[PDB]
Structure formats: C-alpha cells, structure tokens
Ligand binder design. Structure first.
Ligand SMILES: Nc1ncnc2c1ncn2[C@@H]1O[C@H](COP(=O)(O)OP(=O)(O)O)[C@@H](O)[C@H]1O
Ligand SMILES: Nc1ncnc2c1ncn2[C@@H]1O[C@H](COP(=O)(O)OP(=O)(O)O)[C@@H](O)[C@H]1O
Ligand SMILES: [Ca+2]
Ligand SMILES: [Ca+2]
Ligand SMILES: [Ca+2]
Ligand SMILES: [Mg+2]
Ligand SMILES: [Mg+2]
Lengths: 57, 74, 126, 371, 160, 57, 371
C-alpha cells in the first residue's frame, strides 16, 4: 500500500504541474487577445477619420 | 600559468615527437641500415596508431553502452 | 525448458556470443593487419647510392614525427574515453550500488561447513 | 555536416543544431561548488555541478555565474560550461561540427580572442564564427532594416541597421539588464520583511520577478492606485510555504529600465537611448527605423512593455512619424532562431574561420576580414 | 552450487537418501513430515548453534513459489546452494559486457526485439517459447520490451 | 496509509479533469487570436492605402 | 578480517561483528563494587561485577554508570567495560580486529582523544575509527537525506543531513534523555507512597518506565480523563510481590520530553528543537527535511510518540509541507545496524586510523583528516 501511495502522489504532482503550465499559457494568450481587440477598435476609429480626411481634402 | 603549461606541452609534442635525425654521417651502407630502422619505426608507429584508433572506437562504444544504461536507470 | 534447462539455454547463448566476439576480434586483427600492410609498405633497400638514402631517411623522419604526433592525439582521445567511461561506470555504481549492502551473517555457515562444524566430518557433498 | 549554433548568453545557455525552430537544450549557466563538509561516504559527490543540475541541489551550493556583463570573468568555469553543453546536453563531439558563437557589441577584444583560442585548441572544432547578438535577432524577424533593442540578462544593447548596412557609430550599449533588476527587486523586497541574501535565494527572487512583475503603462497613476486599493497584491508561495504578498513592488522592479536612476545609474532609460540611437543616424533613414523598431532578448518579456515603450517613443518622436514596435511571441529565443537561419544559409558557408587559417595567423584572426 | 542445484533436482540415490536420513533423524523433536518454520528452527538449534532466523526465513519463504512457511523440493536445493555463492551470477561483468556490446548490433546500448530473437535463433539450444516470453518479461523492469544491461544481468543471474 | 492513498488518487483525478478543461480553453483562445491577427493585418493594409491617397491629395 | 562494530552508548553497550543484522551481545554498562562485608570464606567473591552479571547480584552492589551524558567520567571503569566486552561477550582478542566506536556530537575533545589512546595502547587494536552517532542511524534507514533525532539514554541530539552533506551549524544537542526520565518517574512515584532510593531500585523504576509508560497524544485531555475514570490504572508486580498501581504517572513521565520545564530545564521540547534545527538550514532543503524526519535511539520507543511528534511539528510547520516521521521497528539498534553497514563498505576501507599514523602524530590524529 505504501508503494501504491507513492505512485498516486507522483501522478497527482505531474497533473498539477501540467495544470499550472496550462494556466500560464491561457493567461498569456488571453492578454494578447485583449490587447489586439483594443488595437482593432482604435484602428476602426482611425479608418473612419482617414476617410473623412480624404473627402475634405 | 596553466595556459603556459598547455602551450609548452603542445610545443613539446611538436618537438620531442621529432627526433634527432643522424643519417648524413651514416655512410651509404649505414645509411641503408638507418633507412631500414626508420621504416621499421614508422611502420610500428602506424600499427600503434591503428590500434589506438580501434581501442578509442571500442571505448567510445562502451561509453555509449554505459550512458544508455544510465538513461534506462534514470 | 526447466530452470536448469533455461540456464543452459542462456549459457549456450553466451557461448555463441563468445564465438561471435572471438571471430570479431580475429577478423578485426586480420583486416587491421591488411590495412597496415597497405600503409606500412616495405621499400627497396639495394641499388640506391648515398644521397637518395639520405633523402629517403629525411622523408622517413618527417613521417615518423607526423605519425608520432597523430599517435599522441589518438592516445589523448583514448585517455579522454577512459576518463569518461570511468565516470559513467562510477555513476552506474552510484545508481545501483552503495545501498546494495547484503546481510553479512557469520552464523549462516555453509551447509556442508555447518553440518561439519555441528557433526564433525559428516558433510562431504557440498 | 550540420553546424552547432551555440549562444553563450549570460543567464541561460541556448544551443542546438542549425536549421531547427527552437534550441535543443536551454539551461542556466551557473557552476556551483558545494560549501558544506559532507559526511556520507561513497555518495558519489562531485566537485562542481553545472547547468540545470545545480538548480536542483542549490540548497547546499554556492552558484556563481561565469559571465558578468557580456564579458567572461572566469575562463575555467566557462570552459566547464561549454564542455557540459557539448557532451551531455547535445552528446555530439565537437571534432565534427562547426560552431557559431554569439557576442555582445563593444566587448573587449581579449574576450573574443580567448573564446576562439579555446574553441580551436581545447574542443578542437573544425571552424567557428562569432556574430553580433543583434544582427541575428534582426534575421529572425525576417526584416532587413530596423533598430533592434536586445535587452538580455547581462547587457542591453541597441544596434540600428538599414538595408543590411550596420551603422557602427550609432550603437548604444547600456549595462542595465535582468540581473540588475533581480538585485533591485531583492533589495526592495526588504521593505516588507522578506530578506533574501544567499546566492541560492537570488534564484527565488528571479522566479518572483519572472512570474509576478509587469511594466506599468503610466507610473504615477499605478503608484497612486496601489497606495489606495488592494487589487494589485498578488501572493506567491516560497519553496517551503510561507506565502508572500507583493504590493507595489510589482511594477517598481521593471520600472528601473525606464528610469535607471533607481539603481543609481546616471544614463537614460531604454525608452530614450533608442531615440538617441535613432537620432545619430542619417536624416533619411529615420522614418524606416521609427517604423521597424524591434524588441528581443529575455528581459523584454514583461507584460505591458511593448505599449509603454511605444507611448514613450511617440512622446519623444515627431508627431508625423508612425512608431511601431515589433514584439514577436518568440522573443526569448529570437537570437538563437536568427543564428540558426544564418548558419543554414548557403551564401554564408564560406565565411567560417577555417582551422588552417587560424594556424597561420593566430587567434587575432577574428578581428580580420573573417569578422 | 551451480552444479549442486541442477544435480539435486534430479538427484540419484546418494544425497537424496542423505536428506531422507536427516529427516528420519530429526524425529528427536521435529515430526511435522513436511518442514515448517518452527520445526526447521528447532532442528537447526538442536544441531548445536543458534543462527539468526532471518537467513532461515529468507531460505524458506523468499525463493519459494508459495512462501507459506513450509519447505518445497526445488527451494530446499536453492537453500543448499545459497549457503555459499558458487553460481557466478551468469559469468562475469566483463564477459557479459563484451557479449552485450556485440549483442547490441545497432550499438545503441539496448537490445531490440528483432536482433534479440535472431541471436536466440543463433543460440540453437532447446527452444521454449513460454520461456522466451518469461525472459521477455524479465527484461521488462522498465517495460519497454528492450533489454538493457541492468535487466540483462538480472535474468542472467545464475546462468551456468 | 490506505486512506491517504485513496485521497491522493482522487486529487490526481481532479487535477486531470482540470487539465483537460484548460487544454480546451487554450485551443479556443488560440483560434480567436489568429482570427484577430488576420483582422489587424487587414486594418494595416487599409491604413497604408489611405495614407498614400492622403499624400497624393 | 572482520571489523568490530562497538557502540559504547550510555546505558546499553551494543557490540558485534560487522556485516550482521543485530548486535551479538547487548548488556547494561554498569560496574558495581560490593558494599557489605561478606562472611562466607572461599565463595569466590570478585571485587567488581560488570555488565549483565551485576544486574543479577544488584541486591548487594552499588551500580554506577561510567558514562554520564555522552562524555565518560570514570576512565578506569570504562576500560573495564571495554575489556569485558572484548574478552567475555565476544571472545575475540582485539589484536586482530579493527574497531568502530561511536560518539555523540559536540562532545569534549579530551574524551575522544583518550578513547583512541586507550584503544591503541591498552587493547592494541590494528586500527580504530570514531563516527557520529546520527550519521549511522541515517545509514540504517537507507536514506541519504533527512534530519535524525537520536534520543538515546544519555543525550538527545538532532543532526540534519542533506544529500550526504552534513550541516555543522544546525546540530541541536539537548541533554534530556532516558536517564532524566527515569529520575523524574522515580520522583513522581513518591506521590502515591512508593519510595525508591537505592541505586539498585533505579533499575526497577527503569523497568516500570519501559513496560508501562506511554506518550499521550493530547496531554490535557489525558490529564482530565485519568482524573475521572480509572481505565488507565495499570498494575505491576515488584521483584518481591506488593503490586503497585500507576495512575496518571504513566503519560506524565515521558511528557517531560515535550515540556522540559517539568524537570526544571529551560529549553524547548524535542518537538520544537527539531523545528528550530530545520529552520537553521537553507531555504531550499527544508521540504526534504520535513518529509524525511527520522527517529532513532532507545527513548523514542514509547508507544504513541510517532504521532504526537508529527502532530506537534504539523502545528509548527507551514500548512503546505508534508510532515512524515520515519519510525522503523528496529529503532533501538538502528545506530548499530548503520555502523555495521558503514564498516562493511569497500569505499570506507581506507578511512581507518592506521596504527603507524597514530605513532607519527599522537592521539590528536582523530581531529585531523581521519575524522
Ligand atoms: N517570462 C519572463 N518574464 C520576465 N523576465 C524574464 C522572463 N524570462 C526571462 N526573463 C529574464 O531574462 C533573463 C534571461 O534572458 P536571456 O535572453 O536568456 O539572456 P541571454 O541574452 O544571456 O540569453 C532572465 O535572467 C530573467 O531575469
Ligand atoms: N521499549 C522501551 N520503551 C521505553 N523506553 C525504553 C525502551 N527500551 C529502552 N528504553 C529507554 O532507552 C534507554 C536505552 O537507550 P539506548 O538507545 O540503549 O541508549 P544508547 O544510545 O546509550 O545505546 C534505556 O535506558 C531506557 O530508559
Ligand atoms: Ca513455503
Ligand atoms: Ca540493439
Ligand atoms: Ca524491459
Ligand atoms: Mg541574448
Ligand atoms: Mg545511541
């Protein structure tokens, strides 16, 4: 039973490590998505401004 | 000076492996004798070289075997 | 095959492996002798006057120096390999030694020796 | 055969065969002798654990980096690191492989000459070539112009390049980098009660810096917010328990990059040395350099730096120019990817320093045509 | 010991009758018929010495296919040959290493299945496919199918 | 020891489930990020054309 | 030849040849001169009965231990004990056998030097080596790390070890041990009417302590329970009849280990000196020491101590770390089993202090490289 307990412990440790890595990856990619969405909104506004400038000039 | 030691070691490799050659005082007959001795020396040297190459190959093979044993145990 | 039979099976396996190792060593030595003979070619000794012999001896000395330096290089390679294999075998010992201490018992006498010490000259088989 | 693209760096040695996407073996460059006495016999205790092995036994070692600021201060340890890298992390004998080391700009000559002498005498490689760490990072981006800010762990240097013609008079090398940020973080953590002193605990502070710190978009507003609310305090569990809570130390550690007066350095931040490096260039290539600013190196991985730097440069630069900051997700290994690309080129195949050339001119060959 | 186990497995009259005579003499206190733990200990003590019982228990339970405290036939000979160490673990580490490195025909430090079976065919001894699977499982300490030198020495223990 | 082993194995199972969910999230966010990167590239091209026309005018 | 693994200890001398499982001869270390006059002539009365012989004639002797707290206070008696151990309990002349004594940590130098001088001059051994009593107990567990609490009968010491490298600055030696518990039990038995005074009756009190006392999991609850019910009162028959009944003296005697204020000692219990010994270690090896806490020595054989100690340390330690207490069933002879293992090693075979070395440097050789 002691050997069985050791095996269970090591499996749990590996699973937790993978979980932590996945958490970090998701955090990074979600931050990237947020930044890109803000940039896209600003870009739409800039595009409208540029079209207005084209018309007036 | 460890670097000084290395440089003097390679200089001694280039110098001591060079021998003092004396064949111009050895007359034509003794010149033939010296040529025979030099050929024997160079042939023995090549035999030693080949044996060292083969032993190095086998030692590398055993190194690979022991490292693979370590990897299987680790 | 029984336990003793499979022990003899693996023993014959070791025997065939020893045959292969011996033939490998023999062919290795023969082919290396062949290669050296291709390298170590004896030259003609008679018919040459003094000057040609002197030039040939100079060339032989240059080749001796070159091959001696090469032999030094290969000897250094061999020494490095010896050091590395020694380290690897020591790590092998560390991985599966040290804590492999057997139960050294001075009261478990050999069956024949124990029977003799407890009975005199009775035990003679083992 | 294939070339070995090694990259000494300072803090992480990255190596691998030429032509791949990522380095094969990445491990810290530390060599730590044991410091206690040792009572168990036959335990097989070595005299120096190098590489990633000494990051697991660091509890009883005294880790010491062999590369201080780009330059190499302890040649025996560096030789040991190279030997480990070749034989145990790649398992390829160097007698059959060209090598491509990397070196920071404006480094002492003796360092480079000793490096080539070691590679040719001890390891006995067929041919080695030394390249500037910024040109490779420009290779990896697939550009051919642009000004690259390669903020490593040892030294931050800023090499501008146009159309493939490097501008040697506009290289601005600054010695603030990740290590000084680690020391400053370790110094400001003492304001809450946590004292890290041992050279082993510097690694723990480095992990804290990597996982928690971020660069603030605006410094004063963040300082005001962290002093009123408590939405920033992130906790972290030490290697033994006793979680710690980092408050406004989070964005104060990497702020040192933009205000080197925090650690007492006089010079201007990485936001202003880039603008100065641009302004030293000619008047007709400033637009292209403005539009193709490249980030590289490990220390430029802080969350939120590609926006702070753009805001700062836009403040400094003329209002008409467009400021764009290239921050690829593979920033850390950008130099090594570029090194692999350069070593894989056919046009580059005749630039190696062949061994016979070294035998004829000595180690001073590196400063010659074969740069 | 290497010869002792094999000979005593199919022993002739002499030493098997020696064992039977010893059993018949043991009726001065031990009469179980089949040697149990306590009767074995009593017999060993009445011999004139008091060895550490750990050796006896490892003799009587470890190597057995039952390990119930009784004594079987083949394991009694295992005990007899375990008093000394004459079976030399299946040759010596140098010879074993040479045969393994030549066995490692692809030179990768491990024995693959295909070249293993080809060499087994080269052996030419009596063939038992059940024994072949037994050796295969003996070479699975790390359960890769391959036999490295560790498990190679492990199942070569006592190969004489 | 038996009770501890059972608890450890249950913990390992829970961690594995969490890891699977994290994998799903990571893949979804990666796809979204790629889509927005393409959108931003289109934004960039539009801006380039508008800038050129502004210069001409 | 074979080595003699002697282990002086304080209370029980354990000896035997190297390579076995258990010591060959275990007997109390007491030397008792007769005290009465003696009228029978020719009875063959000796002048001093040592070892296990004086535990049978203890009715007319004055037993006195030659080892007080690890240190040796009466060298003639200790020499007599060693002579008995070699010649009568093992019957092997010391002229043909190496010896491996054991010594507590932080003991006076003069004790060790006198020990080696005796072994080399009087008994004239070929070579002897002195080892710290805790490293052996760590050998016997088959570990290579861990912090071992070796609560003997003379002195309790707590040596932490990591990866084979002992930490000399974290050894916490405390002088409370089994003998003080015997004296305290003999002192609290007087609260029921039983008075033991003679040095012979100390042995009877020791037997009571061994057979009846146990360590309570929670002290206050046990004190409350024993004061209401009567389910704890266990009786015991003296060597002459007149059974006695021990009430709440059962768990109050060994409780002194965790509250040394009972016998007036200032220091903290064995539950808190282990935590202090851990906290002096480096921050990166505390998890391993937490997980591999080892118990040894005789006094750690009380029924229920491996749970009380774990509960106490879990209370003190951070909540995340796992606390595990290794308590092998062969606790009493753990040091000697480890000594046998160490003496049986091939790597250790050249560490003995050979006699010619002693002849060249004197008894002060023990402090030198041959430790
Ligand atoms: N994800 C990260 N976040 C913040 N800082 C990091 C991160 N990864 C690495 N660093 C910092 O960068 C350093 C590694 O830089 P690196 O690019 O490896 O230097 P080099 O140029 O010598 O290879 C580390 O010391 C660390 O301080
Ligand atoms: N079974 C037991 N239960 C409780 N205490 C014991 C037990 N056995 C021994 N002791 C105590 O331990 C002491 C023996 O400790 P020991 O380990 O022999 O000391 P040393 O380290 O000097 O050999 C005895 O004096 C006794 O008080
Ligand atoms: Ca049985
Ligand atoms: Ca193979
Ligand atoms: Ca296998
Ligand atoms: Mg770099
Ligand atoms: Mg003791």
């Amino acid at each position: 039973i002691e050997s069985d307990l050791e095996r269970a412990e090591e499996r749990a440790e590996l699973s937790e490590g993978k979980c932590a890595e996945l958490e970090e990856e998701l955090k990074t990619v979600t931050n990237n998505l947020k930044s890109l969405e803000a940039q896209a909104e600003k870009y739409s506004q800039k595009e409208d401004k540029y079209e207005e400038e084209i018309k007036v000039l | 000076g460890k670097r000084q030691t290395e440089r003097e070691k390679k200089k001694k490799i280039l110098a001591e492996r060079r021998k003092v050659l004396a064949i111009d005082h050895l007359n034509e007959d003794q010149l033939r004798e010296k040529a025979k001795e030099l050929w024997q020396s160079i042939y023995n040297l090549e035999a030693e070289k080949f044996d060292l190459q083969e032993k190095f190959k086998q030692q590398k093979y055993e190194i690979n075997v022991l490292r693979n044993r370590i990897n299987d145990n680790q | 095959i029984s336990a003793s039979r499979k022990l003899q099976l693996k023993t014959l396996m070791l025997q065939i492996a020893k045959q292969e190792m011996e033939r490998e060593a023999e062919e290795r030595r023969g082919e290396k002798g062949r290669v050296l003979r291709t390298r170590c070619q004896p030259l003609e000794l008679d018919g040459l006057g003094f000057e040609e012999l002197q030039d040939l001896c100079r060339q032989l000395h240059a080749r001796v120096d070159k091959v001696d330096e090469e032999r030094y290089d290969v000897e250094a390679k061999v020494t490095k390999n010896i050091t590395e294999i020694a380290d690897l075998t020591q790590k092998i010992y560390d991985l599966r030694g040290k804590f492999k201490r057997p139960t050294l018992r001075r009261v478990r006498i050999s069956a024949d020796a124990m029977m003799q010490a407890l009975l005199g000259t009775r035990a003679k088989e083992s | 055969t294939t070339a070995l693209v090694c990259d000494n760096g300072s803090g992480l040695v990255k190596a691998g065969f030429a032509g791949d996407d990522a380095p094969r073996a990445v491990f810290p460059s530390i060599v730590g002798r044991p410091r206690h006495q040792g009572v168990m016999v036959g335990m097989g205790q070595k005299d120096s654990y190098v590489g990633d092995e000494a990051q697991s036994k660091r509890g009883i070692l005294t880790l010491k980096y062999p590369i201080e600021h780009g330059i190499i201060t302890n040649w025996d340890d560096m030789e040991k690191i190279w030997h480990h890298t070749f034989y145990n992390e790649l398992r390829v004998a160097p007698e059959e492989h060209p090598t491509l080391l990397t070196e920071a700009p404006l480094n002492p000559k003796a360092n480079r000459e000793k490096m080539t002498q070691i590679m040719f005498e001890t390891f006995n490689v067929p041919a080695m070539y030394v390249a500037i760490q910024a040109v490779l990072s420009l290779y990896a981006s697939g550009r051919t112009t642009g000004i690259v800010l390669d903020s490593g762990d040892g030294v931050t240097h800023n090499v501008p390049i146009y159309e493939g013609y490097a501008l040697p008079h506009a290289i601005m090398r600054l010695d603030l980098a990740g290590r000084d940020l680690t020391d400053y973080l370790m110094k400001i953590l003492t304001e809450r009660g946590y004292s890290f002193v041992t050279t082993a605990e510097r690694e723990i502070v480095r992990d804290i810096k990597e996982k928690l710190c971020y660069v603030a978009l605006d410094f004063e507003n963040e300082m005001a917010t962290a002093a009123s609310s408590s939405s920033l305090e992130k906790s972290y569990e030490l290697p033994d328990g006793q979680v710690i809570t980092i408050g406004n130390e989070r964005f104060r550690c990497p702020e040192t990059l933009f205000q080197p007066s925090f650690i007492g350095m006089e010079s201007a931040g990485i936001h202003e040395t880039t603008y100065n490096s641009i302004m030293k260039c000619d008047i007709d290539i400033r637009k292209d350099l403005y539009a193709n600013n490249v980030l590289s190196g490990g220390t430029t991985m802080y969350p939120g730096i590609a926006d702070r730097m753009q805001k700062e440069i836009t403040a400094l630069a003329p209002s008409t120019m467009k400021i764009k900051i290239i921050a690829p997700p593979e920033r850390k290994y950008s130099v090594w990817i570029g090194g692999s690309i350069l070593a894989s080129l056919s046009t580059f195949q005749q630039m190696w320093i062949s061994k016979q050339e070294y035998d004829e001119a000595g180690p001073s060959i590196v400063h010659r045509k074969c740069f | 010991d290497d010869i002792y186990k094999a000979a005593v497995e199919q022993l002739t009259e002499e030493q098997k009758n020696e064992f039977k005579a010893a059993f018949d003499i043991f009726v001065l206190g031990a009469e179980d018929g089949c040697i149990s733990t306590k009767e074995l200990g009593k017999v060993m003590r009445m011999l004139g010495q008091n060895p550490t019982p750990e050796e006896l228990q490892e003799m009587i339970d470890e190597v057995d296919e039952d390990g119930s405290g009784t004594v079987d036939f083949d394991e009694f000979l295992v005990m007899m040959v375990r008093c000394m160490k004459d079976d030399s673990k299946g040759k010596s580490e140098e010879e074993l290493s040479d045969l393994f490195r030549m066995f490692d025909k692809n030179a990768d430090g491990y024995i693959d299945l295909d070249e293993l079976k080809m060499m087994l065919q080269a052996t030419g001894e009596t063939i038992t496919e059940d024994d072949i699977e037994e050796l295969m499982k003996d070479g699975d300490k790390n359960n890769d199918g391959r036999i490295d030198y560790d498990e190679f020495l492990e199942f070569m223990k006592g190969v004489e």
